[PDB]
């Protein structure tokens, strides 16, 4: 079984978000943080946790959401969309249509490609 | 944020299933395996993995599904409903209604209680 991913822009960068209902908090790898020019945003008063990003822009389809990220030193996925965000947006994970419903957007999960 | 749980009977025992789209495989703790009289079912040709249960009965609402379990020595959750099962049943995680749609069943997630 392939994991669940959607396309998203975080702070205007196109990435692949691993959708994970078993995760309390949306998180991102330090390597991904670099790749999105987000290192400057990092509040280092948090801390293996690199830090916290209080405000970042999520672009999903043609919708825009503020969200927070926790940056980890090393992580298996680069970007992990968590339950925090899922519950906040009363998103629907429909594995019948194979898409994520988040407000007026319906975004398909990617195939292994 | 509270995690996602539903009520289910596995092999006629009432339990609380942690719903987790970020998990490839449905798994169960060794302690939970004991608590469901499932230790006998365990194929020890697998192995920290205690073993694999090839066939177990899931009762969700008034529906019945065969499923496999991987038994782990120690685990944070006791029973974890995975993507394997979610994708297999084209289940829908609706955090708008706060329920799991799996065929003709719609089961509510539990509150912190």
Residue numbers in the entry:
A (entry chain A), B (entry chain A): 201 to 247, 257 to 322
Paper text:
The crystal structures of the RVP domains of Ddi1 from T. gondii and C. hominis were determined; they form homodimers similar to those observed in HIV protease and the reported structures of the same domain from Saccharomyces cerevisiae, Leishmania major and humans. The ubiquitin receptor family of proteins bind to ubiquitinated substrates through the UBA domain and deliver the substrates to the proteasome by interacting with the regulatory subunit of the 26S proteasome through the UBL domain.
The solution had one molecule in the ASU with TFZ and LLG of 29 and 899, respectively, in the space group H32. The electron density corresponding to the flap region was missing. The dimer could be generated upon application of the crystallographic 2-fold symmetry. Similarly in the CrypDdi1-RVP structure, the side chains of residues Met203, Tyr205, Phe218, Ala223, Ile227, Ile258, Thr279, Leu281, Val286 and Leu289 form a hydrophobic binding cavity. Of all the inhibitors tested, nelfinavir showed binding to ToxoDdi1-RVP with a Kd of 237.6 ​± ​6.3 ​μM and saquinavir showed binding to CrypDdi1-RVP with a Kd of 242.1 ​± ​3 ​μM. Saquinavir docked to CrypDdi1-RVP with a binding energy of −6.5 ​kcal/mol in a similar manner as observed in the crystal structure of the complex of HIV protease with saquinavir. While the presence of HDD and the similarities in the structures and the active site architecture suggest that ToxoDdi1-RVP may have the capability to cleave ubiquitin and the substrates upon polyubiquitination similar to the yeastDdi1, in the case of CrypDdi1-RVP as the HDD domain is missing, the triggering mechanism has to be different and is yet to be investigated.
